[PDB]
């Protein structure tokens, strides 16, 4: 993959032009390279989403809702 990418990037140095077979090989190698490093992220819950009674939450903790809110940054530096 790296060799094909470099070869495509340094053809105009020698005043030449690629060929369809080389292009297909480069595309296939690039696809193979991108497949290995592919990661699909997942969407986490909002943070104001209720948690059902079946999870046996407690008023003791903030588990009544999903976490990830980052609240209460109050302090000095007024006008906020």
């Amino acid at each position: 993959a790296v060799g094909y990418q470099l070869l495509l990037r340094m053809l105009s140095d020698y005043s030449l032009e690629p060929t369809p077979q080389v292009l297909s090989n480069a595309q296939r190698s690039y696809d193979a390279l991108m497949t290995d490093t592919l990661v699909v992220p997942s969407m986490r819950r909002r943070g104001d989403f209720p948690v059902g009674q079946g999870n046996k939450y407690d008023v003791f903790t903030s588990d009544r809702y999903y976490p990830g809110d980052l609240p209460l940054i109050d302090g000095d530096i007024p006008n906020a």
């Binding site: 909002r46 943070g47 104001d48 980052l70 609240p71 940054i73």
Partner: protein, 51 residues
């Protein structure tokens, strides 16, 4: 969320709809209050004792 370097919070509106039946039950009780009553027995002087 941060929301472009701030801390705007989610709007959290409250529409209370679970208190109507509770209020109805409370009004039902308060309309007919109940207390303790003493019943007499089969004696010559149980009625005055109960009174």
């Amino acid at each position: 969320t941060k929301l472009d370097e701030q801390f705007e919070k989610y709007p959290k509106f409250e529409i209370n709809k679970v208190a109507t039946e509770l209020n109805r039950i409370i009004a039902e009780y308060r309309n007919n209050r109940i207390t303790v009553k003493f019943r007499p027995g089969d004696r010559e002087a149980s009625e005055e004792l109960a009174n």
